[PDB]
Design a binder for these strands. Structure first.
Ligand SMILES: [K+]
Ligand SMILES: [K+]
Ligand SMILES: [K+]
Ligand SMILES: [K+]
Ligand SMILES: [K+]
Ligand SMILES: [K+]
Ligand SMILES: [K+]
Ligand SMILES: [K+]
Ligand SMILES: [K+]
Ligand SMILES: [K+]
Ligand SMILES: [K+]
Ligand SMILES: [K+]
Ligand SMILES: [K+]
Ligand SMILES: [K+]
Ligand SMILES: [K+]
Ligand SMILES: [K+]
Ligand SMILES: [K+]
Ligand SMILES: [K+]
Ligand SMILES: [K+]
Ligand SMILES: [K+]
Ligand SMILES: [Mg+2]
Ligand SMILES: [Mg+2]
Ligand SMILES: [Mg+2]
Ligand SMILES: [Mg+2]
Ligand SMILES: [Mg+2]
Ligand SMILES: [Mg+2]
Ligand SMILES: [Mg+2]
Ligand SMILES: [Mg+2]
Ligand SMILES: [Mg+2]
Ligand SMILES: [Mg+2]
Ligand SMILES: [Mg+2]
Ligand SMILES: [Mg+2]
Ligand SMILES: [Mg+2]
Ligand SMILES: [Mg+2]
Ligand SMILES: [Mg+2]
Ligand SMILES: [Mg+2]
Ligand SMILES: [Mg+2]
Ligand SMILES: [Mg+2]
Ligand SMILES: [Mg+2]
Ligand SMILES: [Mg+2]
Ligand SMILES: [Mg+2]
Ligand SMILES: [Mg+2]
Ligand SMILES: [Mg+2]
Ligand SMILES: [Mg+2]
Ligand SMILES: [Mg+2]
Ligand SMILES: [Mg+2]
Ligand SMILES: [Mg+2]
Ligand SMILES: [Mg+2]
Ligand SMILES: [Mg+2]
Ligand SMILES: [Mg+2]
Ligand SMILES: [Mg+2]
Ligand SMILES: [Mg+2]
Ligand SMILES: [Mg+2]
Ligand SMILES: [Mg+2]
Lengths: 183, 186, 259
RNA sequence: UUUUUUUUUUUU
RNA sequence: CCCGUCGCUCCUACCGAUUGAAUGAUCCGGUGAAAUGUUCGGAUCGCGCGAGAAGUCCAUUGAACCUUAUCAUUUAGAGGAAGGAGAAGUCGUAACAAGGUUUCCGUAGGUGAACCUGCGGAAGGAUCAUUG
RNA sequence: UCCGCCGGCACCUUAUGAGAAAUCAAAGUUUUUGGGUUCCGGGGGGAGUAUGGUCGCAAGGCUGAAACUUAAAGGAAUUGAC
RNA sequence: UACCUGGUUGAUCCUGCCAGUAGUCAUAUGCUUGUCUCAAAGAUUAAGCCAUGCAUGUGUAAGUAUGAACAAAUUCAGACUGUGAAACUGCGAAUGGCUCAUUAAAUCAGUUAUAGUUUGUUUGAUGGUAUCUACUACUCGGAUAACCGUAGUAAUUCUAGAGCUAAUACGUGCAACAAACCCCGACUUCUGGAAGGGAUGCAUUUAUUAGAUAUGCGAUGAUUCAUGAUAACUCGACGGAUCGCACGGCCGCCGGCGACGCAUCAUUCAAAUUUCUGCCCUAUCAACUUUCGAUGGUAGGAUAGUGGCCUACCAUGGUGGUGACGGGUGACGGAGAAUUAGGGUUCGAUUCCGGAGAGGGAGCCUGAGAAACGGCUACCACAUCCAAGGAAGGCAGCAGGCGCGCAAAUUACCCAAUCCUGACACGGGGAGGUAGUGACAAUAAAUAACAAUACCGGCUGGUAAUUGGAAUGAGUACAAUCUAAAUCCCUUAACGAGGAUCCAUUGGAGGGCAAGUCUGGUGCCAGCAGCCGCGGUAAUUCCAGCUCCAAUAGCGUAAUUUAAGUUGUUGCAGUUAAAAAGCUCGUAGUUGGACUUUGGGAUGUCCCGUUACUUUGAAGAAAUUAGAGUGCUCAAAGCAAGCCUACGCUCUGUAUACAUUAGCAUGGGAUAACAUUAUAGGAU
């Protein structure tokens, strides 16, 4: 027996059933370009997560209103959606979960947030800044654009303290140019 | 060796069973003792499952036999084998197995009867009184009395000589004695 | 197999031990002792996993070989010694006395007890019969044998045993109206009072127990341990007092505590 | 109510 | 538009002398190592006794082999005979129109080939119809 | 001769029915799917062939494969051509 | 998470399949491949064969030291009391690891039973008669290892003599001392009691007896059960001739804490057997089993124990269209995996559970436990060495090699973690872990971002191997960190980007199906094309250039699911598309008309034979699935972790749900099935 064998893993996306739907392709390209995604796999992963959440909500809504399982899991799901900013306090019913779109999840990406608060001139600039270790959520440097920012952590986004845009120690290019200009 | 498993047997429907494992040591069997009557006593020691002990009697001469009516047990000598229900051949070979009918020496029981009832089949006053008191309920089966004349008593072996190494038993009485006497009179 | 198994795979360890899936390929196999393997808590788990005195297997062995841990007032140096229900675990160096009791979720909990409460334990009687020479005796479900027991004591009763003298100082008859704790099944660790007993010839007996909050549950006779006479247990119960809380109320309490 | 057999391959 | 024999190439199986062959499992009978139990035996060792090796006797378990037969899985075979496929082969014109003898089913016989004929049947007919 | 009832072989009209239609008053009461029950088909060929069994005097009957081959074969109806 | 599209025609509506589309914790192969985190990996064909190395040994104060072993002491005495190799003794090696050949009510799952047995060990209790006339118990006897010295052989943990000496080895033996009970019993103030003697521990064997309960006497649903008493029996491996620490109280006698060991019961760790129900295809398998056990009975033998398990005698039984028996399986079973309207279909060699095997059979010793194979014995098949006389074998263990194939990695390091084992806190562990190979599978994620200028389209956007400076990791490397030691990751001095050559690929561009009536070549050739079709001198289809499209560090190609209402129970068809036997009878099977207590008054409550079925409950390994909590930077994951820096706290958490059939218990009595009714032999 190899103990590593007991670790489990799972897939995070599925390929489209019909590869060459023109309307689907146009919509997907529009979303990818708007949010600066690297490929269709990221969009399909977000769609997979949204489908899972919507299926859970739909399953719960089938149960009786007084069912303890429905109460427990619905509260858990609503709290989860509220923590990540998907739903507003007024949106306090499982029904509003079914009205969630891929755009709602995409708007919670660290890349989209970094672009929106004004730390980047463009969504692609936000991507390159994040992957280059210039952004931190709290006191932790984050380099994953897919990072889903919670409501509480949204206001803590700032430049990394060890980066040129957040502290001192300019980049290697600037240091090299300064050294060259010293002569 | 000898095996007690059911693998080799047929199914209750009559179909054949195909082997799926070898013989196991926990379902073994061993050879019979085939104990006999001989002055050369020979009992073998067997180491069995769990480290326990069994006694294999090859030849026995004496046994521990009890008189049920009198509640007396004495060690006497086994004379011969007269009847065996399982197999007639076991009588010719004088095999000693449980439930076999044998003749045993009556001398110890005759001595006990003489000492207890003061009857053959100095003494103090108290002993005489005791014997007289015992004489009121002195009732003896006539068949046992006729047996005592020849010095031999019919008995049944109640022990398993091949397992415990002893040919113990009890003296036939009443209906059982009549049954076996009738079966022997032929 | 050709004989006794000496190993226990980690996935095959009882779930109430709460062993990590990736911690290793093996779990401590309980040794022979007063308690069954599935219904015990080896000292290695207590010292390493629970109390965290030892960070490793070797540290557990080192601690135990100093003769610093006592079970039922007797020093035990066996790491896999099976310590089970109602047992007393004492560490004189740290002035710690523990009693092994089931929590509402059915897992062994090291319940800290006072010095006075650490001098006795409860036992459940299996049967009473005559030994050699006609001497009566009874045996408990923790492997103990006691000669010349009180004639009133019978099977399924609870006896208060003084560890210092190893003598029965009191006993509780199994009857309706007694507070009991369930030691097996899905209801293990719950505490309530017996309501009625159903007896079926040639079959297990059913016991109906009512929780302090009015909740009702039923279990088999062998899973019921009497804790006192009436409604007051003879020993201090762990936190929660054997009251099973539904997941909804547990979540409500957790959310209230968060704020 | 005499007699009347046959039409290379692909494609338009 | 279309049917068959005949003619060419290739492919797939089928039958088949060879009292064919191999493997596995059971069936009949026989021999039978080793071990165990039993009988005899007594090199030798300790105090007339006790222990006791080689060997030997009969049984039990029984490998392995030989004989008979039956199933299961493979496999060789001179030769024979089927089907299929392949742009532009030969002879007819059997089926499609009443296809020029309406077509077809069963059965029997006969012809290079399609097929023809006899008996009874069906319309899926070329007639839903003569109280005329 | 007239009026009725039951049972039978059929016929005519009709769709509120069904159906791919041709047609069907049972081929209806079927995605609004369920009265009971027997048999039996699963693209076209190879093939009702091989093999085994069984019945038969025989002719043959019953039971009945596979390898391989193939994109259609086929049903109803429409227009044209003949 | 309830979905379809191309293809029969001149066109149409169908049947129907072929093709396409998507999936596989699914294998293989092709091309390509920068980073991080996970992770399968000689199962498939050959349970085929194996060179070499390793994988099982083991020591505490507490069994046995005179190494001619080392060290410290002793000037005089000392049996030894420091380390101790070797060796004897004890224990272990029946666990673990590997594989899936055999095996189709068999293994196995759930659910039962042992009142039908064995169980080293752990835990709790319990041990009373031995010599009786020998007469050590202040302590019995004979050997052997290591050692030493004569060796044999080509040779092996192959082997013979000789000289010593130990025990918790071997064999013996007092076993500290009693009472009570029972039998015989001289003697006797004799319905009595009495000296003396026998028996009497625990265990075995057989008998007799008690073990009640509509003035004592235990347990179960149920036992002549637990247990007591008597008579005896057995040539009983039992009832301590053992060891370490300390060092004390009375007047030599007593005395503590332990170790090891023997026996009994209970318990724990388990096994063996066992109850009910359940398994794929096949009738081109309908009868099978019974000399020589088949079904049952009696009595025995054997077994740990039940049992035709075996023997003797007896009887003729046992299974079967509700499919026996026979055959196939590229069949170990299960937990589970893939796909998901629901129902279903397909898979399950492989890490957890159970079984089996160690080249094929068979037999067996040791032991608590094995029909053991890193044990032995024999045969069969292979096969190494030989001095030819003999001698040694078992990788479906870890590596590795040959072979086979479409098809699968290093002859590495370590006991640091998990745990196991031994005399043992310490040794050992190819179990297990680390690292190497590794595009099986899975997770995150680079290959550029921003301004100026010039072009374009409406301050606003798009393009430019034009200009400009900024950013950064791939790489590299001090250092620290990691680690059993290394390595990797994380962190980070000094370097590291303009055609940012630090250069993204795999398939396509007629339709299905996203993307060219572009250019050159070929000319039914070469070729493409899953299908329909392209190519015959103006080819959107071939070979190329350009451009374009899809996915993207991935993509193409060659069993199985969906789509398939094309296997149809839910839910298909049978006039003409494939299809209802020529007709009737008929046993199994399936199915089967109606009818038996309703209502009001009131208020869950009062008044006028056996099953199916349904409700509820218990119990029903984990892992996997669903699911609660939790910022491993995110995620796949994992079972963590959080406040504050208190010499701490949260009793920190480590929930919950699901689970066919069959079994157990419970409420209901509609719908159903089986049985019964009137010759009254009926009820009372
Ligand atoms: K052509
Ligand atoms: K004709
Ligand atoms: K015609
Ligand atoms: K001719
Ligand atoms: K695997
Ligand atoms: K040894
Ligand atoms: K052993
Ligand atoms: K079972
Ligand atoms: K009683
Ligand atoms: K099964
Ligand atoms: K038996
Ligand atoms: K019998
Ligand atoms: K099996
Ligand atoms: K042993
Ligand atoms: K190997
Ligand atoms: K270790
Ligand atoms: K296409
Ligand atoms: K040209
Ligand atoms: K051209
Ligand atoms: K094309
Ligand atoms: Mg094993
Ligand atoms: Mg012509
Ligand atoms: Mg013609
Ligand atoms: Mg003509
Ligand atoms: Mg004609
Ligand atoms: Mg067909
Ligand atoms: Mg479907
Ligand atoms: Mg056409
Ligand atoms: Mg197999
Ligand atoms: Mg069964
Ligand atoms: Mg035991
Ligand atoms: Mg008894
Ligand atoms: Mg018997
Ligand atoms: Mg399996
Ligand atoms: Mg296989
Ligand atoms: Mg494997
Ligand atoms: Mg296993
Ligand atoms: Mg084995
Ligand atoms: Mg082999
Ligand atoms: Mg062998
Ligand atoms: Mg073997
Ligand atoms: Mg081996
Ligand atoms: Mg082994
Ligand atoms: Mg591979
Ligand atoms: Mg991958
Ligand atoms: Mg590149
Ligand atoms: Mg297109
Ligand atoms: Mg051209
Ligand atoms: Mg081209
Ligand atoms: Mg159909
Ligand atoms: Mg037709
Ligand atoms: Mg037809
Ligand atoms: Mg017909
Ligand atoms: Mg018929």
């Amino acid at each position: 027996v190899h103990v590593a064998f007991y670790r489990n893993y799972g897939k995070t996306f599925k390929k489209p059933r019909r590869p060459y739907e023109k309307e689907r392709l146009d919509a997907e390209l529009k979303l990818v370009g708007e949010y600066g995604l690297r490929c269709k796999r990221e969009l399909w992963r977000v769609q997979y997560a949204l489908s899972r959440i919507r299926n859970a909500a739909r399953m719960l809504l089938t149960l009786d209103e007084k069912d303890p399982r429905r109460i427990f899991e619905g509260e858990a799901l609503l709290r989860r959606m509220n923590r990540y900013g998907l739903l507003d306090e007024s949106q306090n019913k499982l029904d509003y979960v079914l009205s969630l779109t891929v755009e709602n999840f995409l708007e919670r990406r660290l890349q989209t947030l970094v672009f929106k608060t004004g730390m980047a001139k463009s969504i692609h600039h936000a991507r390159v800044l994040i992957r280059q270790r210039h952004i931190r959520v709290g006191r932790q440097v984050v380099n994953v654009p897919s990072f889903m920012v919670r409501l509480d952590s949204q206001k803590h986004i700032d430049f990394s303290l060890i980066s040129p845009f957040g502290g001192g120690r300019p980049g290697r290019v600037k240091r090299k140019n300064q050294k060259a200009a010293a002569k | 060796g000898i095996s007690r498993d059911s693998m080799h047997k047929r199914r209750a429907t009559g179909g054949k069973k195909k082997a799926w494992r070898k013989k196991r040591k926990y379902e073994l069997g061993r050879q019979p003792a085939n104990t006999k009557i001989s002055a050369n006593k020979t009992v073998r020691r067997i180491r069995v499952r769990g480290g326990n002990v069994k006694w294999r009697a090859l030849r026995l001469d004496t046994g521990n036999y009890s008189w049920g009516s009198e509640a007396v047990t004495r060690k006497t000598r086994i004379l011969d084998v007269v009847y065996n229900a399982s197999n007639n051949e076991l009588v010719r070979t004088q095999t000693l197995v449980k439930s076999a009918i044998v003749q045993v020496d009556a001398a110890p029981f005759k001595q006990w009867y003489l000492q207890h009832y003061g009857v053959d089949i100095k003494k103090s006053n108290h002993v005489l009184r005791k014997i007289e008191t015992r004489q009121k309920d002195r009732k003896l089966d006539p068949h046992i009395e006729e047996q005592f004349g020849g010095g031999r008593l019919l008995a049944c072996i109640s022990s398993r000589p091949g397992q415990c190494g002893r040919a113990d038993g009890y003296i036939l009485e009443g209906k059982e004695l009549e049954f076996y006497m009738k079966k022997l009179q032929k | 197999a050709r004989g006794l198994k000496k190993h226990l795979k980690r996935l095959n360890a009882p779930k109430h031990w709460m062993l990590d899936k990736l911690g290793g390929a093996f779990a401590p196999k309980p040794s022979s002792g007063p308690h069954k393997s599935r219904e015990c808590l080896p000292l290695i788990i207590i010292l390493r996993n629970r109390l965290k005195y030892a960070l490793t297997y070797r540290e557990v062995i080192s601690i135990l070989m100093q003769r610093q841990v006592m079970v039922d007032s007797k020093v035990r140096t066996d790491k896999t010694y099976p310590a089970g229900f109602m047992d007393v675990v004492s560490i004189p160096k740290t002035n710690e006395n523990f009693r092994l009791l089931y929590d509402t979720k059915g897992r062994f909990r090291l319940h800290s007890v006072r010095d006075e409460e650490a001098k006795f334990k409860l036992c459940k009687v299996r049967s009473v019969q005559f030994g050699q020479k006609g001497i009566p005796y009874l045996n408990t479900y923790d492997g103990r044998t006691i000669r010349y027991p009180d004639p009133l004591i019978k099977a399924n009763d609870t006896i208060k045993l003084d560890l210092e003298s190893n003598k029965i100082v009191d006993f509780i008859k199994f009857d309706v109206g007694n507070v009991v704790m369930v030691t097996g099944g899905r209801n293990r660790g719950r505490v309530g009072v017996i309501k009625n007993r159903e007896k079926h010839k040639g079959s297990f007996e059913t016991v109906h127990i009512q929780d302090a909050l009015g909740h009702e549950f039923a279990t088999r006779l062998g899973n019921v341990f009497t804790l006192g006479k009436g409604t007051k247990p003879w020993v201090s119960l762990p936190k929660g007092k054997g009251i099973k809380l539904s997941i909804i109320e547990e979540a409500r309490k957790r959310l209230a505590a968060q704020s």
